């Protein structure tokens, strides 16, 4: 429990976690479920 | 695991149970249609057993 | 690949080839199917230079 | 243009069943697809009994 590297969204906040591998479900519920939206970015090089 | 059985035939006589009708026996008169099993026809992959 | 390998990357073909045959014209009453195999034909050629 | 029907010979108590799927006409089904340890294995598969 502290804060140095831990991402967010974009106004102020700590992240968590992690996964890993490959191709058909993750973009497979965008010919089925999820949504989109915006332009930014932001984490340290240090 | 999955496991699957393949000999007997239950010398029943309790359960005698049913799901069809009357439309069914097999062509002439008396009705005996009481096999119990003896080996099997199977499938594969992609059109055939 | 080895012999299951290329065994049935083989039957998959058939497979496929029996049910992805003529996909315009059997399912054209679902356009979300249409984009779904669209995108996997761009995105299964590699480019080039 | 009408299409010609060939007939091939087959026993009469042959599996019926065996025909309600992408069959082999022959019988016993073969294809160069059928390989992977020797090269001489296209004869065998499609004639040794």
Same mark, same amino acid.
């Given at each position: ?46 | ?5 393949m ?43 | 690949?080895?012999?299951?390998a #290329? ?7 058939? #497979? #496929? ?8 014209? #059997?399912?054209?009453?679902? /356009? ?14 590699? /480019?080039?230079? | ?10 026993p ?25 340890d020797?090269?001489?294995? &296209?004869?065998? &598969?499609?004639?040794?009994?």
């Open positions: 429990m502290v804060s140095r590297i831990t991402h967010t969204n974009t106004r102020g906040r700590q992240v968590d976690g992690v996964l890993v591998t490959t191709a058909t479900l993750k973009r497979q519920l965008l010919q089925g479920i999820l949504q989109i939206d915006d332009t930014a970015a932001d984490v340290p090089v240090t | 695991t999955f496991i699957m059985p000999g007997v035939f239950q010398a029943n006589s309790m359960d005698r149970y049913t799901r069809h009708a009357g439309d069914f026996s097999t062509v002439s008169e008396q009705d005996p249609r009481q096999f119990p099993p003896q080996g099997i026809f199977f499938y594969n992959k992609d059109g055939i057993l | 690949l080895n012999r299951v #290329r065994a049935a990357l083989l039957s998959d073909l058939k #497979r #496929r080839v029996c049910a992805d045959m003529f996909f315009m014209t #059997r399912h054209a009453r679902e /356009p979300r199917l249409i984009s779904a195999y669209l995108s996997d034909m761009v995105s299964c050629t590699q /480019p080039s230079v | 243009q009408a299409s010609v029907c060939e007939f091939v010979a087959m009469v108590s042959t599996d019926l069943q065996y025909f309600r799927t992408a069959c082999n006409p022959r019988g016993r089904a073969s294809g160069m697809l059928y390989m992977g020797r090269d001489a294995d &296209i004869e065998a &598969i499609m004639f040794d009994h």
